Amino acid sequence: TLVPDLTATDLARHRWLTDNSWTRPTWTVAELEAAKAGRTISVVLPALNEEETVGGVVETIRPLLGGLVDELIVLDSGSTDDTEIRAMAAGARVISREVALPEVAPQPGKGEVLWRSLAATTGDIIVFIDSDLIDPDPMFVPKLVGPLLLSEGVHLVKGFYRRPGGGRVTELVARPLLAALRPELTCVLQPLGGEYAGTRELLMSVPFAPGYGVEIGLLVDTYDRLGLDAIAQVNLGVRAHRNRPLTDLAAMSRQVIATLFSRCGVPDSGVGLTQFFADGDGFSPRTSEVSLVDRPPMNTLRGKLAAALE
Amino acid sequence: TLVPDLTATDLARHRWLTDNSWTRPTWTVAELEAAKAGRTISVVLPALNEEETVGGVVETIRPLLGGLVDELIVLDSGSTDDTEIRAMAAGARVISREVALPEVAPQPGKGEVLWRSLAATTGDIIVFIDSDLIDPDPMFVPKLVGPLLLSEGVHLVKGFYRRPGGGRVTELVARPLLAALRPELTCVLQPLGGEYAGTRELLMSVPFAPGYGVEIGLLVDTYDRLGLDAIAQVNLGVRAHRNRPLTDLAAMSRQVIATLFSRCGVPDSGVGLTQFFADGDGFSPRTSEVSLVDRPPMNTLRGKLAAALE
Ligand SMILES: O=c1ccn([C@@H]2O[C@H](COP(=O)(O)OP(=O)(O)O[C@H]3O[C@H](CO)[C@@H](O)[C@H](O)[C@H]3O)[C@@H](O)[C@H]2O)c(=O)[nH]1
Ligand SMILES: O=c1ccn([C@@H]2O[C@H](COP(=O)(O)OP(=O)(O)O[C@H]3O[C@H](CO)[C@@H](O)[C@H](O)[C@H]3O)[C@@H](O)[C@H]2O)c(=O)[nH]1
Ligand SMILES: [Cl-]
Ligand SMILES: [Cl-]
Ligand SMILES: [Cl-]
Ligand SMILES: [Cl-]
Ligand SMILES: [Cl-]
Ligand SMILES: [Cl-]
Ligand SMILES: [Mg+2]
Ligand SMILES: [Mg+2]
């Protein structure tokens, strides 16, 4: 809706950029573990055919297990390569989508994986880390849980990277649409980032958007329910953006739009994106589908599950 | 709104892709001029500081003047370089925004220029060609007016280019948002293209979006008023996309979104886009503004102007 009271200049100097944004986090693992105060921490790595990188990501996190980190799980998304055994050989516990929630048949896409991981974990804090990262840094998890353990009233922490400019979908799609529909959320540098942490109570009580909608849906639902102050962001360091083909990004953009529209009361047509390429006197069409149906809050399945929710 | 009856596969094979889309136009200038049937044609080149290219674009069109083309105008957008004299030396008539409509003070942006050119031209058909093109082809104008002169019921023709993949704002922003909000318009390959033609009656009767919103606003207003059949597209040939910085494209995307939202009943916040860059412990913010106010249909000023509307 129309917000004539707010300007981009206002947003450029928002107090949130000072109080809830850490460009140089200096927390130590020891003071984070001392601040757990009985809360447990689960780290979840979604993985669809990431045999080349999953072990490297796991090993950056494995030394924390039994100290800061209580559970280290790779949620296997139906991989056909060697993802599972390499994750196990690197020290992670691996759980398939079926084992995570056997009563419900798996759907494709990343949101399904993160949603199912709620039923597979027990931590009061859940940290999500992508398993395709080529150069993961071992301070990812400590930085992501810092604001949850050492600030007040934070329930969602987004990890951003400094650019040595950035992601095309982030800068052209997600952030301009957030300026139009949820302008305070443009304070978040990288709303589509895959490295973030949330408290279980929050995550059990929001729907999970399907496919690549999941990050932006969680950000907007958190903002709508709890306000900007409940969100924080932390600099995870320098990561160069790797190249993805424009055609993949366009299908992903379509789903980001559908998920944002469904959270913001915008009636999305539900129609997938067609992409055309030259042929002769006609085109070579390429289509993708979009989903407008969330997985409901995991709390709604409570008491119906053979493995009980924590 | 929700369109469960339409699918991307339906759109990939839409009859419109056959009847209103020309990948190999073979009209001759002679048969186009014979089909004018008393209609006149005005060619308008908006130009803001294009001294290096404007003359080259004009010269590709100048041989048509007095035959197919009745008026060849560069609408000078407040240039401070040598745009005006180079356009004149290349054979164009040059009209400033002030001279085009002296009763109204100029606003910045491309939409203002195209809107004012309606008052400066007399043609029954108006062709818009960007003045920054490095390699303009002399068949642009003939191809753009072909469907207007030789088809039935066409009022807007969009020129597209084959890629020797494409524009980032087009593929990630405009076309996925059109899939969500006006899915039939995803049949248009390049909705943000600057080379297009329209009939005067249509163009005098729609508002003109400001800045870079103007192309997408004209496309959606034409579709809403007249249907997909009233729109056509023609292959202008091979043009490689030149590189523009991501930060420019993000501000442009924000305005494309605001204009699309204003045509589709989506309440846009009106808040401009902030972009952040690393500094030290803080950021270097960069802001841009967005406009939600159109210029009204030029027909509404009819009879109030010292130079009468055609
Ligand atoms: O069905 C799926 C798809 C992906 N993944 C995993 O999820 C991660 C991210 O998937 P990827 O295709 O690499 O996403 P990106 O292209 O990097 O997309 C960016 O933007 C998306 C939209 O917010 C986020 O979900 C991503 O984490 C973020 O990196 C990887 O570990 C994948 O193996 C699954 O487990 N299952
Ligand atoms: O205030 C302005 C801005 C631009 N122009 C002229 O308009 C043309 C296009 O401007 P440019 O900044 O080069 O646009 P693009 O980055 O190429 O934007 C693409 O996408 C836009 C959104 O639809 C279209 O308006 C453009 O024509 C299209 O080329 C050029 O001849 C400019 O000189 C003006 O006359 N006045
Ligand atoms: Cl390995
Ligand atoms: Cl599946
Ligand atoms: Cl991105
Ligand atoms: Cl010159
Ligand atoms: Cl101006
Ligand atoms: Cl583009
Ligand atoms: Mg990735
Ligand atoms: Mg240009």
Q: Is A132 left (phi over 0), alpha (psi -120 to 50) or beta?
A: alpha
B89, B60 in Cβ contact below 8 A? Answer: no
Q: How far is CA A107 from the centre of its chain?
A: 18
**Tokens 């669809």 belong to residue:** A48
Does B269 reside within a domain?
no
How many separate helices (H) and strands (E) can be counted in chain B? 13, 10
Q: How far is the CA of A267 from the centre of ligand 8 (A)?
A: 25
Does A205 reside within a domain?
yes
Does B85 reside within a domain?
yes
Does A157 reside within a domain?
yes
Does B37 reside within a domain?
yes
- What is the distance between the alpha carbons of residues A206 and A209, in angstroms, rounded to a whole number? 9
Are the beta carbons of B7 and A271 separated by less than 8 Å? yes
Give the alpha-carbon dihedral of A220, A223, A228, A233, to 10 degrees: -50
Pick from A13, A23, A267: CB nearest B2: A267
B85, B106 in Cβ contact below 8 A? Answer: no
**Tokens 């674009």 belong to residue:** B57
Q: How far is CA A229 from the centre of its chain?
A: 18
Q: How far is CA B8 from CA A77, A309, B20, B176, in A?
A: 26, 39, 19, 11
Structure tokens belonging to residue B73: 């105008």
> Between residues 167 and 226 of chain A, which touch chain B (CB distance below 8 Å)?
168-169, 171-173, 175-177, 179-181, 183, 186-187, 189
Nearest to A44 by CA among A146, A144, A127: A127
Q: How far is CA A86 from CA A57, A81, A89, B206, in A?
A: 11, 10, 5, 61
- What is the distance between the alpha carbons of residues A168 and A224, in angstroms, rounded to a whole number? 25
Tell me if residue B305 falls in helix, strand or coil.
Answer: coil
- Beta carbon of B47 within 6 Å of any ligand 2 atom: yes
Q: What is the phi/psi pair of residue B257, to 5°?
A: -65, -45
Domain range for A159:
8-259+288-301
B211, B218 in Cβ contact below 8 A? Answer: no
* B201: enclosing H helix or E strand: helix B200-203
Q: How far apart are the first and last CA of chain A?
A: 38
- What is the distance between the alpha carbons of residues A7 and A2, in angstroms, rounded to a whole number? 11
CB neighbours of B142 closer than 8 A, spacing ≥ 6? B27, B28, B29, B32, B64, B68
- What is the distance between the alpha carbons of residues A89 and A290, in angstroms, rounded to a whole number? 36
- What is the distance between the alpha carbons of residues B50 and B202, in angstroms, rounded to a whole number? 29
Does A240 reside within a domain?
yes
- What is the distance between the alpha carbons of residues B217 and B264, in angstroms, rounded to a whole number? 10
Nearest to A165 by CA among A70, A259, A238: A238
Ligand that comes closest to the CA of residue A131: 1
Structure tokens belonging to residue B3: 């369109």
Ligand that comes closest to the CA of residue B129: 2
Which of B127, B132, B220 gets mutated to test ligand 2 (max ligand atoms within 8 A of its CB)? B132
Are the beta carbons of B9 and A287 separated by less than 8 Å? yes
Give the alpha-carbon dihedral of A229, A230, A235, A239, to 10 degrees: -120
Tell me if residue A266 falls in helix, strand or coil.
Answer: coil
- What is the distance between the alpha carbons of residues B68 and B35, in angstroms, rounded to a whole number? 10
The CB-side HSE value for B100 (13 A sphere, CA atoms) comes to: 28
Does B186 reside within a domain?
yes
Min CA distance, B55 vs chain A (Å)? 31
Residue-level length of chain A = 310
Q: Which DSSP state fits B45?
A: E
Q: Which long-range contacts (CB under 8 A, 24 or more apart) does B133-136 make?
A: B133/B53, B133/B56, B133/B57, B133/B239, B134/B53, B134/B56, B134/B242, B135/B239, B136/B56, B136/B57, B136/B60, B136/B61
- What is the distance between the alpha carbons of residues A281 and A175, in angstroms, rounded to a whole number? 38
- What is the distance between the alpha carbons of residues B283 and B289, in angstroms, rounded to a whole number? 19
Nearest chain A residue to B182 by CA: give it: A269
- What is the distance between the alpha carbons of residues B248 and B169, in angstroms, rounded to a whole number? 10
Nearest to B218 by CA among B308, B128, B136, B310: B128
Q: How far is CA B226 from CA B32, B110, B156, B174, in A?
A: 24, 24, 10, 20
Q: How far is CA A145 from the centre of its chain?
A: 14
Residue-level length of chain B = 310
- Beta carbon of A125 within 6 Å of any ligand 1 atom: no
Structure tokens belonging to residue B12: 């990939």
A220, A263 in Cβ contact below 8 A? Answer: yes
Neighbours of A15 (CB within 10 A): 10
Paired with A295 in beta bridges are A208
Does A223 reside within a domain?
yes
Neighbours of A12 (CB within 10 A): 19
- What is the distance between the alpha carbons of residues B182 and A268, in angstroms, rounded to a whole number? 10
Q: Which DSSP state fits A116?
A: H
B241, B167 in Cβ contact below 8 A? Answer: yes
Range list of H helices, chain A? 8-12, 16-19, 29-34, 54-61, 83-89, 97-100, 110-120, 140-150, 168-169, 175-181, 200-203, 214-226, 246-263
Q: Is B66 left (phi over 0), alpha (psi -120 to 50) or beta?
A: left
Q: How far is CA A98 from the centre of its chain?
A: 21
Query: Domain holding A237: CATH number?
Result: 3.90.550.10
* B18: enclosing H helix or E strand: helix B16-19
Q: How far is CA A277 from the centre of its chain?
A: 32
Residues in chain B after which the chain is broken, C→N over 2.5 Å: 164
Q: How many domains does chain A have?
A: 1
A16, A188 in Cβ contact below 8 A? Answer: no
In total, the C-beta contacts within 8 angstroms joining chain A to chain B are 192
Pick from A3, A172, A288: CB nearest B250: A172
